[PDB]
Amino acid sequence: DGNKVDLYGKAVGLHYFSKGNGENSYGGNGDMTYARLGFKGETQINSDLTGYGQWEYNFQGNNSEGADAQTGNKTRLAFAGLKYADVGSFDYGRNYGVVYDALGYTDMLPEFGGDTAYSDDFFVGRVGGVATYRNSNFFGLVDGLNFAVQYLGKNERDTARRSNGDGVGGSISYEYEGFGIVGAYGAADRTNLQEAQPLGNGKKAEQWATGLKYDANNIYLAANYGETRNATPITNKFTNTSGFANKTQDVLLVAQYQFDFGLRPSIAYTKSKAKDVEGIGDVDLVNYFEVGATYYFNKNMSTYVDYIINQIDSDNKLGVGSDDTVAVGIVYQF
Amino acid sequence: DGNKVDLYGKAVGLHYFSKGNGENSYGGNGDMTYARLGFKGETQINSDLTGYGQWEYNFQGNNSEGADAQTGNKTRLAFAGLKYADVGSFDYGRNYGVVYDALGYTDMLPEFGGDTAYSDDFFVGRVGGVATYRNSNFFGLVDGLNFAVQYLGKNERDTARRSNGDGVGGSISYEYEGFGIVGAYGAADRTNLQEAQPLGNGKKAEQWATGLKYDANNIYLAANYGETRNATPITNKFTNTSGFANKTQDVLLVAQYQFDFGLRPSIAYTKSKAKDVEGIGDVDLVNYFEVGATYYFNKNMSTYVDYIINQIDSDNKLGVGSDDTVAVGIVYQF
Amino acid sequence: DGNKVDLYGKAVGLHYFSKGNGENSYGGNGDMTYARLGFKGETQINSDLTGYGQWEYNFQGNNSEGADAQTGNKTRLAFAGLKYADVGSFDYGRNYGVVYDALGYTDMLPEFGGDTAYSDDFFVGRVGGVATYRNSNFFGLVDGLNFAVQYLGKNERDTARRSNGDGVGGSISYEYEGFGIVGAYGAADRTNLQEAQPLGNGKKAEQWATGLKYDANNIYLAANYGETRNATPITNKFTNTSGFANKTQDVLLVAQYQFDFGLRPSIAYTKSKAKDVEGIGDVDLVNYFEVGATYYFNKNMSTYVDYIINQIDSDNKLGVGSDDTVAVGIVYQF
Ligand SMILES: [Br-]
Ligand SMILES: [Br-]
Ligand SMILES: [Br-]
Ligand SMILES: [Br-]
Ligand SMILES: [Br-]
Ligand SMILES: [Br-]
Ligand SMILES: [Br-]
Ligand SMILES: [Br-]
Ligand SMILES: [Br-]
Ligand SMILES: [Mg+2]
Ligand SMILES: [Mg+2]
Ligand SMILES: [Mg+2]
Ligand SMILES: [Mg+2]
Ligand SMILES: [Mg+2]
Ligand SMILES: [Mg+2]
Ligand SMILES: [Mg+2]
Ligand SMILES: [Mg+2]
């Protein structure tokens, strides 16, 4: 009856290599195997109207069958919506925060990358309780011009890190001839639990980002810049103190090429600097170069290596790990 | 070849609006998105015999991807059985309590309702370890006459609220010309842990209900009345004390219409009164009117609003919420 | 596009009968209902090369929908790999040890059996972080001659029971005209947390087993013999101390017949004895006879009974359970 639903997923055999047991590395050390399961469906309601829904789950494959069986298991996405011919889509539930419309540009590495797209972090990553309106080609009048607004409902959780107040954010993008340019901005109230943390001071959190990319002829090139206020979560590893960076400035870059025979090498740089952090001043949160590659056997099977050359120094005042990490992956997906 | 199984699910974007906080409301306040996933299968073994099984899970969509990720996640149903031609069906596992053959009559609202069909609550909701026998049209000899019996095995759990002793229950119903009537009753042993609770006293739990319904010509009218002894779970928020109501008296009413263009308005009333509650006597547990509507775009897509006009008063002796609660939902299902 | 993926699972209505709880039985008492869900996929990359992946999850059906909802839920398998023409298969993730290549011989009972194939126990059961290479028919040159090697990456977990160090293990088998013979062995480092336990002492865990089987003409006969040194997990029930048996010796015998009409009687014997147990000396871990049966209605539906005649005596120095257990099961699978 014009419903299309496709159960999807992957099994990801994954191993991280880092110094020691990886307490002072970028990614850690050991087994990091996991699996994904989801559905994605879409129903033709009439000529002009589609309904749709999606759910996606993370099942870790590197816990025992003992008491730790559920460590890092979670729902990543859960949302439903309606899409109306020449007017836009509207969805609600657990979904990507708008500002990920910009950060998605550089979140293209075989394993790492994407460092500033925190989950449960306002308009940066996948969160809870968002209403999202999206528009393609400006109601159909302007090919390549897209925009979105997103309404974030307050989530007063048990942890400051996973909480938020009410907020609004949005995004505008233009694509033309393989190039793409995009800007995204959100702000939200911070909750009383966030204000009580040692790190971070202010009533509102803000995040913004811009992106430029070239995505054509088997070349992928992209850059993202942005900044945040009272929005980037941080932990002092020395004091076990936590909260949010009063300011960050963040800059990511990525260069890839896709060979017809399956190989797709990747080169990147990422740097995120916190400022005005209490007791500290300026610090680096992320600072690295990346070399990697993915080999695609076909649409269902790939392998990959991903090497993070970590520029964080062993000095780092927040305890951010300074050692390198290499990831090795085998993936079956459907 | 012989076998039919169909993966099923829904994604529900869901939001509740109450004063506060929602501490003092019927339903709470904020994001309540969730998803469901299940399978349902039937195999033709021969001409007279079919095997079947069902599993159903709830994935909350309004938790973070942190330490609270698993909150409210659970298996709803997990059972397997055989259905023999003129004998009946026999199944075992986690399934609906028998007395829910009565309560289902009124559990028909867009979001709320069904207030007395508690889970893990002897016979009124989905419970563990039930062997259920069911019969259609009295061995095929009496059109519209159905019955069932169910054996509940002891579950001594860590919690009095989620426990039970051994029990037996059943249900009888007759349907004719769009009308339906149905009686159900179960009784069981209480566990020591339940007897140790300050609220509620008795060796035995009991629950019964009767149902009346009209279900034709696009009209749905239904009413349930019931009582319980030592069965309905309760809390006194003034004392942080818990247990079970020595007695309750329960009445639910529902009226709905289905318009061919998809709109289905709903009107309801629910009162549940506890009696003989230690240090209190009588006290309402539930008391409200409902108005709502579901808009069905088709078999896969729907939206709804449900408004609960809460008649509980701010003097209620157990601290039961007195504020209403409006729910708004968007549903993709397959 | 040359991909075949099956979603699969089962619903198992399951009940165990034992004296009392029974806190002193082989298997326990009460509702043991569960379900499984998994996918299994295979993609033809080219005429000589296949990709594959598998995920499998256990969903308990005997928990309430309260705080205990998650007890016993776990990923059993999560792996992906490549299979090349005659050269062999390579996979990584959570998978069966390499010593279960032998123990699978007798792990054939309707419900029980398989006592020495502990999960998260080096090479005997399902684990986390294994790299497994497998070869059939010695590169296509010797019909019926198969072998495998497996590399076990260290998992330092919160618990001694679920930890391992790095190890290697392997297996070799040979089948000809319904007869089968197998040998398997592995060794790995113990972790410091393991060595810190009062029970067990040694740098290295080791496990080995051999198997003979006849599997033809509806007869199934199999035997396994095995030993372990610092690998088999134990608890002293009197003193509440835990660790690993310094040694064990294990025998598991099985006989079954498959009638064409669906019945499949089973008879078994299992004994595992620990030696050099701190504070104790020699003591039986498992000692029983089995007598059960499985009735297959078809490929999707079965029932079974499994009766374990426990020869553990009430004298057991470790407090191992001595009473019998009977299981009754109903299974829908797809
Ligand atoms: Br995926
Ligand atoms: Br994160
Ligand atoms: Br559903
Ligand atoms: Br029920
Ligand atoms: Br309703
Ligand atoms: Br409930
Ligand atoms: Br299965
Ligand atoms: Br191909
Ligand atoms: Br185990
Ligand atoms: Mg773990
Ligand atoms: Mg502060
Ligand atoms: Mg600030
Ligand atoms: Mg460095
Ligand atoms: Mg009492
Ligand atoms: Mg009121
Ligand atoms: Mg020791
Ligand atoms: Mg005995």
Whether A161 sits inside 8 A of B66 (CB atoms) is: yes
Q: What is the 3-state secondary structure (H, E, C) of chain C?
A: CCEEEEEEEEEEEEEEECCCCCCCECCCCEECCEEEEEEEEEEEEECCEEEEEEEEEEEECCCCCCCCCCCCCEEEEEEEEEEECCCEEEEEEECECCCHHHHCCCCCCCCCCCCCCCCCCCCCCECCCEEEEEECHHHHCCCCEEEEEEEECCECCCCCCCCECCEEEEEEEEEECCEEEEEEEEEEECCHHHHCCCECCCCEEEEEEEEEEEEECCEEEEEEEEEEECCCEEEECCCCEEEECCEEEEEEEEEEECCCCCEEEEEEEEEEEEEEECCCEEEEEEEEEEEEEEEECCCCEEEEEEEEEECCCCCCCCCCCCECEEEEEEEEEC
Whether C159 sits inside 8 A of A59 (CB atoms) is: no
List the structure tokens of B8. 């099923």
Residue holding tokens 């090139």? A221
Which ligand has an atom closest to residue A243 CA?
11
Q: Are the beta carbons of A235 and A242 closer than 8 angstroms? A: yes
Which ligand has an atom closest to residue B191 CA?
14
Burial A116-140 (b: 16+ CB within 10 A, else e): bbbbbbbbbbbbbbbbbbbbbeeee
Which of C232, C33, C37 lies closest to C121, judged by CA?
Answer: C232
Contacts with C52 (C-beta within 8 Å, 6 or more apart), sequence order: A332, C40, C41, C42, C43, C80, C81, C82, C83, C91
From CA A290, how far away is CA A270, in angstroms rounded?
8
Sign of CA dihedral B134, B136, B140, B144: positive
Distance from CA of B28 to the nearest CA of A (A): 13
CB contacts of C30 in chain B (<8 Å) are 129, 153-156
- Number of domains within chain A: 1
Cα A23 to middle of ligand 13, angstroms: 13
Distance from CA of A329 to the nearest CA of C (A): 9
From CA A253, how far away is CA A225, in angstroms rounded?
9
State the CATH number of the domain containing residue A77.
2.40.160.10
Interface contacts (A, C; CB < 8 Å):
142
Q: State residue C276 phi and psi, 5-degree precision.
A: 55, 35
From CA C333, how far away is CA B54, in angstroms rounded?
10
- Structural domain boundaries enclosing A308: 1-334
From CA A80, how far away is CA A298, in angstroms rounded?
31
Q: Are the beta carbons of C201 and C192 closer than 8 angstroms? A: no
Number of residues that this document lists for chain C: 334
From CA B234, how far away is CA B250, in angstroms rounded?
15
Instruction: Cite the beta strand spans of chain A per DSSP E.
Output: 3-5, 8-17, 30-31, 34-44, 49-60, 74-84, 88-96, 126-135, 145-152, 167-176, 179-189, 204-216, 219-235, 242-257, 263-277, 281-298, 301-310, 325-333
Q: Are the beta carbons of B286 and B268 closer than 8 angstroms? A: no
Which of C14, C60, C68 comes nearest B162 by C-beta?
Answer: C68
* Bridge partners, residue C242, by sequence: C235
Contacts with C251 (C-beta within 8 Å, 6 or more apart), sequence order: C223, C224, C225, C226, C269, C270, C271, C272
Cα A294 to middle of ligand 8, angstroms: 16
From CA A107, how far away is CA A133, in angstroms rounded?
22
From CA B166, how far away is CA B246, in angstroms rounded?
19
From CA C254, how far away is CA C252, in angstroms rounded?
7
Chain B residue with Cα closest to A162: B64
What are the Cα distances from residue C226, in Å, to B233, C211, C247?
53, 9, 11
* Bridge partners, residue B284, by sequence: B273
SS3 state at B4? strand
Residue holding tokens 């993709």? B332
From CA B188, how far away is CA B150, in angstroms rounded?
11
From CA B297, how far away is CA B292, in angstroms rounded?
16
Cis peptide before B218 (omega within 30 of 0): no
One-letter amino acid of B66 = G
* Bridge partners, residue B204, by sequence: B189
Whether A64 sits inside 8 A of C162 (CB atoms) is: yes
Which of A224, A268, A270, A251 lies closest to A105, judged by CA?
Answer: A224
Cα C199 to middle of ligand 16, angstroms: 5
One-letter amino acid of A181 = I
CB contacts of B298 in chain A (<8 Å) are 1, 43, 45, 51
Q: Are the beta carbons of C331 and C249 closer than 8 angstroms? A: no
* Bridge partners, residue B130, by sequence: B93, B152
Sign of CA dihedral B245, B246, B249, B250: positive
Whether C297 sits inside 8 A of B74 (CB atoms) is: no
Burial class (CB in 10 A: 0-12, 13-18, 19+), C149: middle
List the structure tokens of A12. 């990801």
Which of A45, A76, A91 comes nearest B298 by C-beta?
Answer: A45
Q: Are the beta carbons of C61 and C32 closer than 8 angstroms? A: no
Whether A128 sits inside 8 A of B62 (CB atoms) is: yes
From CA B313, how far away is CA B311, in angstroms rounded?
6
Which of C178, C136, C8, B334 lies closest to A42, judged by CA?
Answer: B334
Which of C30, C35, C298 comes nearest B78 by C-beta?
Answer: C35
B44, B94, B127, B194: best to mutate for the C interface, most C CBs within 10 A: B94
Q: Are the beta carbons of B27 and B325 closer than 8 angstroms? A: yes
From CA A275, how far away is CA A288, in angstroms rounded?
18
B touches which chains (3+ CB pairs under 8 A)? A, C
From CA C183, how far away is CA C212, in angstroms rounded?
9
Contacts with C205 (C-beta within 8 Å, 6 or more apart), sequence order: C122, C164, C167, C187, C188, C189, C190, C194, C228, C229, C230, C231, C244
CB contacts of C7 in chain A (<8 Å) are 7
Q: State residue A192 phi and psi, 5-degree precision.
A: -60, -35
Contacts with A175 (C-beta within 8 Å, 6 or more apart), sequence order: A144, A146, A181
What are the Cα distances from residue A318, in Å, to A194, A241, C96?
19, 10, 41
Contacts with C175 (C-beta within 8 Å, 6 or more apart), sequence order: C144, C146, C181
From CA A278, how far away is CA A276, in angstroms rounded?
6
Contacts with A28 (C-beta within 8 Å, 6 or more apart), sequence order: A16, A18, A22, A325
Q: Are the beta carbons of B12 and B61 closer than 8 angstroms? A: yes
Q: Which residues of B lie closer than 8 Å to C, measured between beta carbons?
A: 2-3, 5, 7, 39, 41, 43, 45, 49, 51-55, 57, 70, 72-76, 78-82, 91-94, 119-120, 126, 128-129, 153-159, 161-162
Q: State residue A63 phi and psi, 5-degree precision.
A: -105, 165
SS3 state at B241? strand
From CA C204, how far away is CA A158, in angstroms rounded?
43
* Bridge partners, residue A5, by sequence: A41
Distance of CA B33 to the CA centre of its chain: 19
Number of residues that this document lists for chain A: 334
What are the Cα distances from residue B120, in Å, to B97, C28, C33?
9, 21, 15
From CA A305, how far away is CA A300, in angstroms rounded?
17
From CA C136, how far away is CA B35, in angstroms rounded?
43
Contacts with A10 (C-beta within 8 Å, 6 or more apart), sequence order: A35, A36, A331, A332, A333, A334, C53, C80
The number of C-alpha atoms within 13 Å of C110 and in the hemisphere containing its C-beta is 31
Number of residues that this document lists for chain B: 334
SS3 state at B192? helix
SS3 state at A194? helix
Whether A15 sits inside 8 A of C75 (CB atoms) is: no
Chain B residue with Cα closest to A127: B64
Contacts with A62 (C-beta within 8 Å, 6 or more apart), sequence order: A30, A31, A32, A33, A34, C94, C128, C129, C155
List the structure tokens of C318. 């470790």
One-letter amino acid of B162 = R
Query: What approach was used to elucidate this structure?
Result: X-ray
Which ligand has an atom closest to residue B254 CA?
5
From CA A8, how far away is CA A3, in angstroms rounded?
16
From CA B72, how far away is CA B70, in angstroms rounded?
6
Question: N- to C-terminal Cα distance for chain C?
Answer: 24
Q: How many degrees, rounded to 5, is the angle at CA A205 between CA A276 and CA A191?
A: 110
SS3 state at B300? coil
One-letter amino acid of A231 = A
Contacts with A142 (C-beta within 8 Å, 6 or more apart), sequence order: none
What are the Cα distances from residue C224, in Å, to B7, C145, C268, C269, C275?
39, 19, 12, 11, 19
Resolution in A: 2.1
For the CA atoms of B186, B188, B193, B198, what is the dihedral angle to 10 degrees? 60
From CA B221, how far away is CA C160, in angstroms rounded?
60
Q: Are the beta carbons of B73 and C69 closer than 8 angstroms? A: yes
From CA B100, how far away is CA B119, in angstroms rounded?
11
From CA A265, how far away is CA A288, in angstroms rounded?
17
List the structure tokens of C298. 């078809």
Which of B30, B33, B301 comes nearest A94 by C-beta?
Answer: B33
Interface contacts (A, B; CB < 8 Å):
138
List the structure tokens of C147. 């072998």
Residue holding tokens 């002009």? A48
Contacts with B96 (C-beta within 8 Å, 6 or more apart), sequence order: B77, B125, B126, B127
From CA C317, how far away is CA C209, in angstroms rounded?
26
Q: Are the beta carbons of B35 and B11 closer than 8 angstroms? A: yes
List the structure tokens of C107. 């792990």
Cα C58 to middle of ligand 1, angstroms: 20
Beta carbons within 10 angstroms of residue A107's beta carbon: 18
List the structure tokens of C149. 């090697």
One-letter amino acid of C175 = E
Q: State residue B104 phi and psi, 5-degree precision.
A: -55, -25
CB contacts of B72 in chain C (<8 Å) are 69
Bridge-based pairing of strands C247-257 and C263-277 is antiparallel
Distance from CA of C177 to the nearest CA of A (A): 35
Instruction: Cite the beta strand spans of chain B per DSSP E.
Output: 3-5, 8-17, 30-31, 34-44, 49-60, 74-84, 88-96, 126-135, 145-152, 167-176, 179-189, 204-216, 219-229, 233-236, 241-244, 247-257, 263-277, 281-296, 301-310, 325-333
Sign of CA dihedral C96, C102, C105, C106: negative
